[PDB]
């Protein structure tokens, strides 16, 4: 076979150990998930906007008493107007308070006032993968593989808890002080025991079944991993057009072309992730995540060493000191206006 006796036994024992780990991780998650206002706004000084989206913004803040820096996500309660927008914001807070994994950002406080919802998270000063990737062009295959391995382990963790992530992209991946990834932005994450139906995500990363208004499962995250690996290794994603409708037509076609510099092992992995047929997509078969972890492209990957953070990272961001923002782009700064009157009090009671 491909493995000799010793290798095959080591790999099986490894796989049993993964099961043991995930069983303990589920027990820990459920305790927190069943038992989910730990600060207030005037406890922080607002420093700089780190990113901006449709419903709000993430700001660097400094805690007045301790001087610790944090990233604060502010959502305008009124702007969270659409139905799926509301439920999504409750998913995000509940999931982030309950998970624990080395590549998932840590939530420290959450609170709300008359106008906004707030989630205060660890500040990760190395910046988004997005801007490093756009600046350099593309990552070499070993560099892309180091980041990909962390996403595979993170999805194996999330999916074992029946959580789907639903927004993988370089914009949502921060690089920490050791060069490892922190996944942020759980705004679309959801606990799903089987299928779900919301049309959501980012166009370039959507699996065909989402676009086609089919009920879908955690396999959409494995499709997205294929898009992410392609984009890291090529510098642009596989389904690339100026307008969302044209992107969707490319995704559903089931045609992908690869740069001539992609190795054959990488193309084979990507063909199996970017697979429109769900009965054939890696991560969705009898062997589950092991079809990915055991693929030839990952043959050099020490999965446990990645988890344990023992592997030397390809890139360490320059760090100028606590609260440095040099690795982030600039954004327009807007007032944090808090109304005299409570808005949407009933719709956010559980937050």
């Amino acid at each position: 076979g491909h493995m000799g006796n010793a290798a095959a036994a080591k790999k099986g024992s490894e796989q049993e150990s993964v099961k043991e780990f995930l069983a303990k991780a589920k027990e820990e998650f459920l305790k927190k998930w069943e038992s989910p206002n730990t600060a207030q706004l005037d406890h922080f000084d607002r420093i700089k906007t780190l990113g901006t989206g449709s419903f709000g913004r993430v700001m660097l803040v400094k805690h007045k008493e301790t001087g610790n820096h944090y990233a604060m996500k502010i959502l305008d309660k009124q702007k969270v107007v659409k139905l799926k927008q509301i439920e999504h914001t409750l998913n995000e807070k509940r999931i982030l308070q309950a998970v624990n994994f080395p590549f998932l950002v840590k939530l420290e406080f959450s609170f709300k006032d008359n106008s906004n919802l707030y989630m205060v998270m660890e500040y990760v000063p190395g910046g988004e993968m997005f801007s490093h990737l756009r600046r350099i062009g593309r990552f070499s295959e070993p560099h892309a593989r180091f980041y990909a391995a962390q996403i595979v382990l993170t999805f194996e963790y999330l999916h074992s808890l029946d959580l789907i992530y639903r927004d993988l992209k370089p914009e949502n991946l921060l690089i920490d002080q050791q060069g490892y990834i922190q996944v942020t932005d759980f705004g679309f994450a959801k606990r799903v025991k089987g299928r779900t139906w919301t049309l959501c995500g980012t166009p370039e990363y959507l699996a065909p079944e989402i676009i086609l208004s089919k009920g879908y499962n955690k396999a959409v995250d494995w499709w997205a991993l294929g898009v992410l690996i392609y984009e890291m290794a090529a510098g642009y994603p596989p389904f690339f057009a100026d307008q969302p409708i044209q992107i969707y037509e490319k995704i559903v076609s089931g045609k992908v072309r690869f740069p001539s510099h992609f190795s054959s092992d990488l193309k084979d992995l990507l063909r199996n992730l970017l697979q429109v047929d769900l009965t054939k997509r890696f991560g969705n078969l009898k062997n589950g995540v092991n079809d990915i972890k055991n693929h030839k492209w990952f043959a050099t990957t020490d999965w446990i060493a990645i988890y344990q953070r023992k592997v030397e990272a390809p890139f360490i961001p320059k760090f100028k000191g606590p609260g440095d923002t040099s690795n982030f782009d600039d954004y327009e700064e807007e007032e944090i206006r808090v109304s005299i009157n409570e808005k949407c009090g009933k719709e956010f009671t559980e937050f």
């Binding site: 989206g53 449709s54 659409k82 756009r134 995500g201 980012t202 166009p203 994603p237 100026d242």
Partner: peptide, 13 residues
């Protein structure tokens, strides 16, 4: 040709 800047998620589209 395709989108090179940051990409916004879609909530119900």
């Amino acid at each position: 040709a395709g989108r090179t800047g940051r990409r916004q998620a879609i909530h119900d589209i």
